[PDB]
């Protein structure tokens, strides 16, 4: 009866997953794995399944290893958690789709659209239904496009600039200002001056939050032409 | 004592380099008498701020008024520190052009009256001043250099001026994306109908920098 439909339905879901990843790593994935995740009646079973699938798309090799270890359900509940967090969902989804793009291989589907399409009356969807909505799109063979996330732009400067400190050194800050052609209207600020404006201790250096804070001044300094 | 006022006059005149000039001659002890500590310190700060302009005001008998005004502009809630900065900028312009900043003056002083008096002391020692803008100033500036907000089009002109907006072995595949103005807005969930508000400009600033440092355009 249902055992059998579930097996054809879930079986087909597994087959599209395997295909989109080009694992048609595919052997490890079986209907019984998907069955193992939960009893359909349990509230948050669609979520757990949608997340488990998203994980598979996100990391096939890694998700087989987890499946073998019998921790697929746990790792799926973990992802729902990461995304259930305060302001976590939108950027978490972006990162998740970037990975799914990586492993997946004209207009395409983006996270804002997925957030719209799940959830109600202009509000963003919550993780389970959002991920389901993602799955349903994978099933329709939609392509995905993602823009980067706000944190990505600050993170990027900390990864790119070569420094032993966890924060940006006044020296580091000054090298960057140089690369940008920098370091009332017409004053030209030093790196130190920049720090002084935002009440930043040179011993403490520039943290990511701080980089974000002093960003407008770096722009102004460039547009100003003062330097 | 008009002996004291006399010396005050002489430093004021000197630090502005009006000693053997007409702008120094307009300043008379009786002017200073006509003008209490606060009013005097402010009147003097004004003179240092704008000698030519302050003679015209003095000769019109409105020096006291203009001085009470400056005390007002500085009496306010979070007015004093930045007001003092702007004032010192002007005074550095007219006199000269290891330094003293407004936090130091506030500490050494002890509101506006005694602070101005301490500024004046420093002018007397010949100290140099170092003054900074406020964080708000940097956002507020871009908006001048006319919808109320910045248009997507405006945003795009700015990105062009910065060499971005599109007008090898990447650690992240986003490292290669070159964002449109519209994309920039999309990242931060900003409506194109509303435009870029100052708070929004602040928010999207890091991406403009990244886009340049990235070399993706």
Numbering used by the authors:
A (entry chain A): 37 to 60, 64 to 144, 151 to 228, 262 to 305
B (entry chain B): 42 to 76, 84 to 145, 152 to 164, 171 to 205, 209 to 230, 256 to 305
Sentences from the paper on this structure:
A ZIP4-ECD from Pteropus Alecto (black fruit bat, pZIP4-ECD) was found to have ideal behaviour in solution. pZIP4-ECD shares 68% identical residues with human ZIP4-ECD, and cell-based zinc uptake assay confirmed that the full-length pZIP4 is a functional zinc transporter. In one asymmetric unit, two pZIP4-ECD molecules form a homodimer. The structure of pZIP4-ECD shows that each protomer has two structurally independent subdomains. The structure of pZIP4-ECD is stabilized by four disulfide bonds (C59–C64, C67–C103, C153–C188 and C266–C305). Two pZIP4-ECD molecules form an elongated and wing-shaped dimer: the two PCDs pack together and form a central dimeric module, which is flanked by two HRDs forming the ends of the wing. Structure superimposition of the PCDs reveals that the HRD of molecule B (HRDB) rotates, from the position of the HRDA, ∼20° relative to the PCD dimer, suggestive of structural flexibility of the bridging region. Most interestingly, the absolutely conserved proline residue (P294) in the PAL motif, together with a highly conserved serine residue (S293), are located at the cross of the two α14s which are at the centre of the PCD dimer.
ZIP4 is the exclusive zinc transporter specifically expressed on the apical surface of intestinal epithelium and responsible for dietary zinc absorption. ZIP4 knockout in mouse is embryonic lethal, and loss-of-function mutations of ZIP4 lead to a lethal genetic disorder, Acrodermatitis Enteropathica (AE). Structurally, the LIV-1proteins share a similar topology: a transmembrane domain (TMD) with predicted eight transmembrane helices and a large and variable N-terminal extracellular domain (ECD). In this work, we present the first crystal structure of a mammalian ZIP4-ECD at a resolution of 2.8 Å, which reveals an unprecedented dimer centred at the signature PAL motif.
